[PDB]
Structure formats: C-alpha cells, structure tokens
Design a binder for these strands. Structure first.
Ligand SMILES: [K+]
Ligand SMILES: [Mg+2]
Ligand SMILES: [Mg+2]
Ligand SMILES: [Mg+2]
Ligand SMILES: [Mg+2]
Ligand SMILES: [Mg+2]
Ligand SMILES: [Mg+2]
Ligand SMILES: [Mg+2]
Ligand SMILES: [Mg+2]
Ligand SMILES: [Mg+2]
Ligand SMILES: [Mg+2]
Ligand SMILES: [Mg+2]
Ligand SMILES: [Mg+2]
Lengths: 56, 84, 136, 94
RNA sequence: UUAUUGGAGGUAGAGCACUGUUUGGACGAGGGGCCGUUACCGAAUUCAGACAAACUCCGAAUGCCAAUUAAUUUAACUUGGGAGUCAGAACAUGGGUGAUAAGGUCCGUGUUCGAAAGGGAAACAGCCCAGACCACCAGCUAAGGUCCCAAAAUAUAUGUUAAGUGGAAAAGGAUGUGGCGUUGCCCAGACAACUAGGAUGUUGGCUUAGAAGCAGCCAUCAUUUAAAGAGUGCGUAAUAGCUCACUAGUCGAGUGACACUGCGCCGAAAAUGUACCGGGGCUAAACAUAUUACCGAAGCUGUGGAUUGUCCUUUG
RNA sequence: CUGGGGCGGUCGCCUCCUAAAAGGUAACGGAGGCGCUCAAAGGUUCCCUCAGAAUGGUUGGAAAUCAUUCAUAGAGUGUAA
RNA sequence: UUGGCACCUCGAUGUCGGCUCAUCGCAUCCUGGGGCUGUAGUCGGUCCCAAGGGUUGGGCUGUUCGCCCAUUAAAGCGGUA
RNA sequence: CUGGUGACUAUAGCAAGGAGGUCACACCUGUUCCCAUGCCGAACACAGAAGUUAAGCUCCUUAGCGUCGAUGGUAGUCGAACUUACGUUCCGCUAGAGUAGAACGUUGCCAGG
C-alpha cells in the first residue's frame, strides 16, 4: 500500500503529466489516494514524482 | 526614408509530401489488402503473403499478423502470417 | 588567407557553437600548442594575423602548423536592406572553435620562445587560450 | 612499482564526479587470469608509479587481497583540466 | 496514463567506409634543365591529424505504431440541432532567416495570457506560486520572505568579501585576498640588503664613416680565480664613464617558482533629479554551506450556507 | 502574394535539404527538375555482368579495336533528385 | 548618423530652416590645476582633473551644413518630439 | 566420410601454406546425332572413357586482411531543480571510437560409404 498525495499543482505543467496525475486518481492539490504498489503504479509515480509525495 | 532595391530568390519550390513509411505495426492484425509500407524502391521487401505494388507499396495478401523481419545482413522484409 | 578551393554549397546554415571540441584536442605535430578555452568563430583573417605574428617572432627558426581550417562560408546581406528576399552573399570563411581545440602548434624552438610566440598569436584571436605541451 | 586500488559497485554520474573531485581515477582491470574488476586508484600515486616504471612498465596492482601484474592498456585524459579521467589495466600473462 | 514485449525510422553524438572539404610528413609510374640523379614530381600510393543542412561504415535519448497484454483512471466513438473562430502575444526550448541584432520574422515542442481573479516579481497581460460557488475578526502551507517601511529569525554553526562588491558589461591588466596541490634553495647559512671584487687574450671576427661587452650579422671560446657574460641595463659619434650578472664577506630563518580553484579590483562617459538595492538603511540586514523555527494566497483544512449530480436509499 | 505599396520576382506539378531518427510542418529559406519520351526503352522465356587500371599488340596516339590479369560496384538504370 | 523592426498615435501626435526663450550632459573650445615630452626660452604635442562662468559680427545659399571676409581668450560637441 | 539440397547478420569470407583420387566431381577425348557460336564444339549440347590430380573441387593449419566484439569510461539525451551562463546540478537511458577478446563456421533432410 502506498499513500500518494498531490503536493504541487498541475497548473503550468505539461498535459501528459496532468494525464498521469488524473490516471493516478488524484484530483485537487493535496488530495490523496491509497493504491497497491506494483511496477505500473511505480512508473506513474516516477513520471510525476516532482508533483507528488509518496508514503509507504 | 531611404529604401534599397532587393533581389529575388530562384528557389521557393517543393513537391507535396507523399506520406511514406509504415502503415501498420509489427504484431498488428490486418485484413487482406491492407497497405503495410509506402516507399520508393525496396527499402523493405515483401515477405510471406505480402505483395509489392507497381510503385513498391507493400501490402498484405491474407488476413493475419504483420511481422517485420531481418532479410540477410543488410536488408529487411515484412510478412503477414495467419492467426491460429 | 585560407579558404576551400571549392565547396558544394556556398550558402550554409551557420554551425552549432555549443558543446565541446569534437577532436583535435592534443598536440600531434609539434612540441607546443595553443589550446582554446572558449568558443568562437575564427576567421581566415584572424588565422592569418596570428600565424604572421607567431612566425615573425620565431624568425623562421621553427615550424608552425595551423590545426584549424575555415571550411564554412557565412553570408551577409547588402547594406541597408530589409528582411527577406533570399539569403545573402558569401562574406567570409570561418572555423568553429570550442574549448580544448589546438589552434596552432610549433616545434624547433625553445619553450620560452614558443610561449612568447603563442602569446603574441593569442592576442590576435577572439578566444581565450592556454599554452600546452605534448602529453605523455 | 606497486599501487593499491579499491573495488567499485554500481556508480551514478554524481558518484563518478565526486570520485574525480576527490582525486581518484576510475579504472577497469581485465585480461589474462582475471575477471573484469571496476576499481578506483589515486591519481598522484598512479602518476608516481608511471614515472617510475615507464609508459609500458609492469605495475603490481593491489586488487582487494590479490595482487595482479598489469600494464596500462589505455587511459582517458581531460586536457582542459589536465586530469587523468579513466584507466584500463591489462593483466598480462606470465 | 503507466508497466512489459515487438516493430518502423537515420536525428543528437560519433566517424571518415562513400561524396565533397582539408593540414603536415614519407615516397615517387614516369618523364623533363642535369650528368644518370639537388625543380615540377603535377600522378598514384602511404602515415598521422581535421571539416559537413542537402556526406554516412555507425548510431542513441525521446517521440511514434501496436499487443486475445496487466495496473490505475474516465473517457471514447456514431448520428442529428445550434455555434463562434480563420489579426494572436510573451516566456522557455529545437531550428531557418537576420548580424549566434530586435519586444524582429517564420516553422517544431511546452506553459501562461487571450478568456484568470488571488500571492510573489517595487509598479509590470504573457515570468514564479496557484485556478475565486457564498459567508467567518479560525488553522496549515506554495512561490517569496523574516532590521524599519511591512507579516515573520537583528536565528544557530563554520567560512569568504572590504569592493556598498552585494545592488549593470568585455578583451586585457594587477605583489588584493582565501583554499588545495607540485616543486627549487636554505643554519655545510638560503631570499633581500650592505662591504669588496666584477679581471686577462680583447678594441673576438665581419660590417661600418665609427661599431671598442652593449646598431646589425657570425661565433660566444681560452687563462688567474675565492668568482666575473666575447656581457644585464644606462651612457658615448666611437671611446670613456656608471651598472648588472657572478663570487667572497656581514646578517640570521625562512625564501622563490609553477598548476588548479573561491571571492573581490581596474577597464566603466549622457543628457529634467539622487536615479543600475522600491526607500530608509546594512559590513551583514552581503555571499557559500548546513540546521531549526516562523510569516506568507481567493491553494488546502475547519464551521455554516446555495445549486446541480452520484450513491445508499421513503426517512435523511 | 509582398517584412507598407509601386517596381523586381513568383503562382500548377515532381525530388532533396531546412524537418527536431513515425507522419506532417513555414519564410520573397538552400538546391534542382516537369508540361515529355519509348512500337521498344513494353510482356515473356533463355542467357549474360560493369566502370577503371596494369601488362603485351600495327595503322593506333594517354584514350578506338584485340588478349590476360586485377578490379564489389566507384558502371548502368530514357529524363532532376 | 544611415538603416532594420512595425510596438503607441491615421473619429490628425504639424513636417525643414530661422526667430524668441532657454535647460541639461561632458566625451572640455577658452579660462583654472596637473603628469609625460623627441619640454632650452617663447611656443607647442599628448594625456589626467575640472561643467563655475564664458564661448563674435558679416558675404553666399531656404537652407542645416559648408566655403569665405574680419575678429576673439575661445569662436566646443551633443540631448531636451 | 563423400555427395546432393536447404537454414542461419562472413564467428561462415579473403589470403597464404599443405594433402587427396579405381568409387564419385572434374579436368579430359571427340563432333555422327539433338543442340550451339552476331566468328569460334571456348561456351551451350550431345557421344565417350585413353590420360591426370596440374587446375577446379574437397579436406587440414593459421589471426596477415575482412567479419564479430565486451566490461569500464566518455559524448548525447528523457525528466526534474537552478539558471541565462557558447550553462550548472541530480536521476534514468546510454552510444560512436577504441581495448580485452571470439572466430579459418554451425546445423536439417536425402542417397551412398
Ligand atoms: K584573446
Ligand atoms: Mg553532428
Ligand atoms: Mg509556440
Ligand atoms: Mg479577443
Ligand atoms: Mg505556520
Ligand atoms: Mg514586523
Ligand atoms: Mg478553495
Ligand atoms: Mg518593415
Ligand atoms: Mg519525419
Ligand atoms: Mg508581428
Ligand atoms: Mg482624438
Ligand atoms: Mg571629465
Ligand atoms: Mg564649464
């Protein structure tokens, strides 16, 4: 289980990164999701790691 | 205000681009007749169940999966194989 | 005045100047060399000025090698003309120099003479330079 | 005609940069009687050893516990910095 | 969207195998002035070293097309009713053009403005943070900040700067200062200073009107030395004269060279008024590296409220 | 159309580069072609392999034709790339 | 200065020269203070500090400029639509 | 083992040296016959078996050329942070060249031995 929080805004970020933020299930700034850790999730996280905070 | 005479360019021509290249992916299912590859000459050769049109276009002859394959050391081909 | 006897294209895109020297970064013909540390176009006129300065100081005793060559033509528009209406005419020839390239080499003289000659040469050039020896 | 090195792991660009800043040279030992080994040496000590033994001299390289007789197969050099950047050691057969 | 797998393709880099460009050698199939041998060797070959948008023996990162494909997500497509739009801008980045000019111009990629209020950037569409449903004299944060203007550190530790550098600029110039290295000489007395010497063949030879250490060319050798250049500068028309190198002595502890780096200095002249920190002011209230706090938005959270959806579900 | 307009140049089609390794992509950016040709220079069957160089050989020379060897594409592919 | 660009103004931002009135900058023409000089003196050359004040009437030409006459310690160079 | 006929990016090739023949493969002997030469029985075609391993062909040796080729490092670069510096930093991916080294092929089917 991973707690993922959108800590920086998507404003001013590329549309591809915004699409990844949406695909992670994050909605508003400081919103959070709890997801099962796996390579696909880790790849999404890695793509947007400058925008999110991850807690195990 | 002072204005100098200008020359002309003898250039400024180009033909329409021909949208060449791959039209279907390796591993993709295609129906018979689907164009696989647009080209000048044989940059890629017709393989199994693939024909070569009068202008070198590569096309499938059967329904099946496209496969781009090595042909010898320097060449390559594209084939279509029927799915089970 | 160096320039190619001919080229296939007289009107060329100006060369990239970012990055480091692709090659010619070592003294390979003489004993001493002048190594560029900054980036610039180097013109045939600048090459000729530096060559004359260093050879005149060396007083024909030693041998000089020009390691760079101005392959690239650059154009310039005629005076006081507006934008457009084709590319301008060839104005000169330049060699692109990036940090590390050896511009000149010298042999057959003492290290002190080589240093003074290459100092005189460097003051003619639009790049910062440093005196270099053969490495081993 | 001897010098000691230290084994490396898997190193990032920053790791290599910090090595070279500290004053050590990355290198690889390969050749007869040995597997490839990624090593660090000290640049000043390597320069001293090369001055002593010559360009083609044989060096006794301390690789962990073992000692290998090697020759400098090649080296990469940074002439703007006047810094040896990398070394290849060829363990010669006897 | 990501993961994995397959594939198309020739860019960045690199390279010189092709097409062109190009620098030094070596050698010359063969003929000429030359008798065999001292041009051209234009050829070819060969070694080493370079250049390319329209070169390529090579060749990425990405992006792209797919998959009886997995995870997360919420779209997607078809048909029909109604539109508006067809002047775009800055910024960043890949390029052409221009002059590696323009707040220039034209394409690629992204963001923002347009059509976006709020906080920062003095003021400042396009930059940085961030997307305002409404109310609150509640809380946490972002960028950016915390001496006063003006909310919050005259915070903690270790250094650098002396230039108000910070708070505009270059080639180049400089015993500014800090750090990290290498190295020469030295109590068998170093560096500097002071005392003394600094001589002989000889006015070396040539050249010149003259050229005697000291216009310029060729050399740059010998004798006594405790050492002294066929001479480091000044001087003469040339000499003369002064001086240095070098050596011995006095003195007594450090002294010189080089490489790489941090921060500063000069180079630096415009017009209404200080006027190139927003002001006052600052020697830290500057800069670098760490650490702990706090301030800071219409972002988020708390409380109440409106509207519209979704789901439990009469109720709410 | 047009880095104001006039004047100059250009207007359709093909190839390359710019074009940022899919495709596409602008400027009065950099280069060239086209408005045909062939009755075989088309179809098919069978067969064949170049350019160039060296060495010999008469008229014949640096290059005509003949012979051997070397020669992997430097030839040819009607016509630009 | 000559231009390049086309960002304000085309429901108007009057355009050269002169006159009147100036004002500012200093990259200084004179006057003041200096260094070097291939500065004997008298003169000069060149550079540094310095913007307080001063810095002329005429001939020609619409002219600005420029040439010329005659002076002056000097007859400065620029910005202010 | 020999041959025929396939597959595989030359690790398979080239070059040099060496060995082989009643089987078989060739060279080889001929031009009556089918067939053939812009001339040529050279070739193609056919008939044949006196001679030869000389050449082809097969096999063996090698590392001179060609081919293949790491690891390590470097260039470049996706993303991020800082920046206008012909930039810096961090992370991932990661060449080309070169080096060590590999390599004088590996195999399927069929008929003979
Ligand atoms: K210079
Ligand atoms: Mg390149
Ligand atoms: Mg854009
Ligand atoms: Mg509008
Ligand atoms: Mg707080
Ligand atoms: Mg306060
Ligand atoms: Mg809100
Ligand atoms: Mg214009
Ligand atoms: Mg493309
Ligand atoms: Mg415009
Ligand atoms: Mg009005
Ligand atoms: Mg002044
Ligand atoms: Mg004054």
């Amino acid at each position: 289980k991973l707690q993922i929080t959108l800590t920086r805004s998507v404003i001013g970020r590329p549309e591809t990164q915004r699409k990844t933020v949406e695909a992670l299930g994050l909605k508003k700034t400081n919103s959070s999701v709890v997801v099962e850790d796996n390579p696909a999730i880790r790849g999404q996280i890695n793509k947007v790691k400058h925008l999110v905070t991850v807690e195990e | 205000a002072s204005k100098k005479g200008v020359s002309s360019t003898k250039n400024g021509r180009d033909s329409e681009s021909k949208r060449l290249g791959a039209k279907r992916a390796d591993g993709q299912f295609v129906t018979g007749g689907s164009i696989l590859y647009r080209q000048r000459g044989t940059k890629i050769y017709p393989g199994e169940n693939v024909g070569r049109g009068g202008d070198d276009t590569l096309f499938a002859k059967i329904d099946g999966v496209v496969k781009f394959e090595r042909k010898g050391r320097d060449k390559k081909q594209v084939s279509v194989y029927a799915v089970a | 005045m160096l320039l190619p006897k001919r080229v296939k294209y007289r009107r060329q895109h100006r060369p990239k100047t970012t990055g480091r020297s692709k090659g010619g970064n070592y003294v390979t013909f003489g004993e001493f060399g002048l190594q560029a540390t900054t980036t610039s176009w180097i013109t045939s006129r600048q090459i000729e000025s530096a060559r004359i300065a260093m050879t005149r100081y060396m007083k024909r005793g030693g041998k000089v090698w020009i390691k760079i060559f101005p392959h690239t033509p650059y154009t310039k528009k005629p005076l006081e003309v507006r934008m457009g209406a084709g590319k301008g005419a060839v104005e000169g020839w330049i060699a692109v120099v990036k940090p590390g390239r050896i511009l000149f080499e010298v042999a057959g003289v003492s290290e002190e003479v080589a240093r003074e000659a290459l100092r005189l040469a460097s003051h003619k050039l639009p790049v910062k330079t440093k005196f270099v020896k053969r490495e081993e | 005609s001897l010098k000691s090195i230290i084994r490396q792991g898997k190193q990032t660009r920053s790791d290599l940069k910090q090595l070279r800043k500290s004053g050590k040279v990355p290198a690889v030992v390969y050749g007869y009687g040995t597997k490839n080994v990624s090593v660090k040496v000290d640049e000043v000590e390597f320069i001293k050893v090369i001055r002593e033994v010559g360009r083609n001299g044989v060096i006794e390289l301390g690789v962990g516990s073992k000692t290998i007789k090697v020759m400098v197969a090649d080296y990469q050099f940074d002439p703007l910095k006047n810094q040896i950047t990398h070394i290849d050691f060829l363990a010669i057969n006897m």
